[PDB]
């Protein structure tokens, strides 16, 4: 229902791509977004349909939340950017020329193509056959101070996860395609988990709000006033909506979103406020005795 206004600003275009942003940015009721409605179909993406009203890869990006890469893109033996892509197994849609991902380093990596070029299944190469980016990974983002400056990958007796070979081995080795849990903190790399413990912290910051749902359009929540507040516009709500903000009775209505909140998740122990957290189907080589 109420899953199409984003919080913060709601951009959801890539940087290379920034032809259909009419309806695409920023996002709301209009319908025609290929970089978020993408995101929304039931059973795809089953995390980030679960924390709906957190921030997609892209929003984070231009939230300026997370970083890009040097290379930003990557054209199509081939380019050193691919070792990247070529361990994580992803299936991009036809008639897509980019796709973004999180990097190694926590920034944001697209892969592009020619003009008419499509992206392959795979999205390794570039075939032939809309404007605009494929989220190859599942995940979410959300605002957070937490240094990760100590954090890092362990996991149980692995040898080698993704880009990532934890430890050296010579032994009696295992490859599979697994889908790993991973999340980034501010001054960590990509840490990937074995058991994924994310908890949810509900509260009553503007994030976790939808708003004018009566009388559909977005309204920016940062024009209600607040108890005492100067306001500039007139809003209503719900009994949470009315505790922090004035109410009366009409230029908006605000709700609470279910699981909006600051998300902390658990690394070896530790609870961390992580920057993203997300699923990734890559190269994992266990060890065995
Ligand atoms: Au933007
Ligand atoms: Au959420
Ligand atoms: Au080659
Ligand atoms: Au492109
Ligand atoms: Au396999």
Same mark, same amino acid.
């Given at each position: 229902?109420?899953?199409?206004?984003?919080?913060?600003?709601?951009?959801?275009?890539?940087?290379?791509?920034?032809q259909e942003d009419?309806?695409?940015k920023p996002v709301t009721?209009?319908?025609?977004?290929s970089s978020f409605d993408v995101l929304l179909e039931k059973g %795809?993406?089953?995390?980030?349909? *679960?924390? @709906? =009203?957190?921030r997609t890869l892209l929003e984070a990006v231009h939230d300026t939340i997370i970083a890009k890469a040097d290379p930003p893109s990557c054209d199509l033996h081939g380019n050193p950017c691919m070792k990247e892509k070529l361990v994580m197994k992803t299936h991009?849609?036809?008639?897509?020329?980019?796709?973004?991902?999180?990097?190694?380093?926590?920034?944001?990596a697209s892969v592009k193509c020619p003009p008419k070029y499509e992206l392959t299944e795979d999205c390794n190469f570039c075939r032939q056959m809309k404007k605009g980016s494929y989220p190859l990974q599942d995940l979410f983002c959300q605002s957070?101070?937490?240094?990760?400056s100590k954090l890092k990958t362990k996991m149980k007796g692995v040898c080698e996860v993704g880009?990532?070979?934890?430890? %050296?081995?010579?032994?009696?080795? *295992?490859? @599979? =395609?697994?889908?790993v849990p991973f999340a980034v903190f501010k001054n960590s790399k990509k840490v990937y988990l074995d058991k994924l413990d994310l908890k949810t912290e509900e509260n009553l910051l503007?994030?976790?709000?939808?708003?004018?749902?009566?009388?559909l359009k977005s309204f920016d929540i940062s024009q209600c006033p607040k108890i005492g507040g100067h306001g500039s516009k007139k809003c209503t709500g719900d009994a949470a909506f009315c505790s922090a903000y004035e109410c009366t009775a009409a230029n908006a209505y605000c709700s609470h979103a279910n699981g909006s909140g600051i998300v902390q998740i658990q690394v070896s122990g530790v609870w961390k406020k992580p920057l993203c957290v997300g699923y990734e189907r890559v190269v994992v080589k266990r060890e065995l005795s």
């Amino acid at each position: 229902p109420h899953l199409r206004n984003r919080p913060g600003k709601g951009h959801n275009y890539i940087d290379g791509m920034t032809q259909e942003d009419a309806t695409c940015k920023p996002v709301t009721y209009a319908g025609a977004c290929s970089s978020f409605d993408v995101l929304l179909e039931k059973g %795809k993406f089953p995390l980030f349909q *679960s924390y @709906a =009203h957190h921030r997609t890869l892209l929003e984070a990006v231009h939230d300026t939340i997370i970083a890009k890469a040097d290379p930003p893109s990557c054209d199509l033996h081939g380019n050193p950017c691919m070792k990247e892509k070529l361990v994580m197994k992803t299936h991009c849609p036809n008639d897509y020329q980019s796709a973004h991902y999180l990097n190694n380093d926590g920034k944001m990596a697209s892969v592009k193509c020619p003009p008419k070029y499509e992206l392959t299944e795979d999205c390794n190469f570039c075939r032939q056959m809309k404007k605009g980016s494929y989220p190859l990974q599942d995940l979410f983002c959300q605002s957070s101070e937490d240094d990760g400056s100590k954090l890092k990958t362990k996991m149980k007796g692995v040898c080698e996860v993704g880009v990532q070979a934890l430890k %050296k081995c010579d032994g009696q080795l *295992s490859t @599979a =395609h697994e889908v790993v849990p991973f999340a980034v903190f501010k001054n960590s790399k990509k840490v990937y988990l074995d058991k994924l413990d994310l908890k949810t912290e509900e509260n009553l910051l503007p994030d976790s709000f939808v708003c004018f749902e009566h009388k559909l359009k977005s309204f920016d929540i940062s024009q209600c006033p607040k108890i005492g507040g100067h306001g500039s516009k007139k809003c209503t709500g719900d009994a949470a909506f009315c505790s922090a903000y004035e109410c009366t009775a009409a230029n908006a209505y605000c709700s609470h979103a279910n699981g909006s909140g600051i998300v902390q998740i658990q690394v070896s122990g530790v609870w961390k406020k992580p920057l993203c957290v997300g699923y990734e189907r890559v190269v994992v080589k266990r060890e065995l005795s």
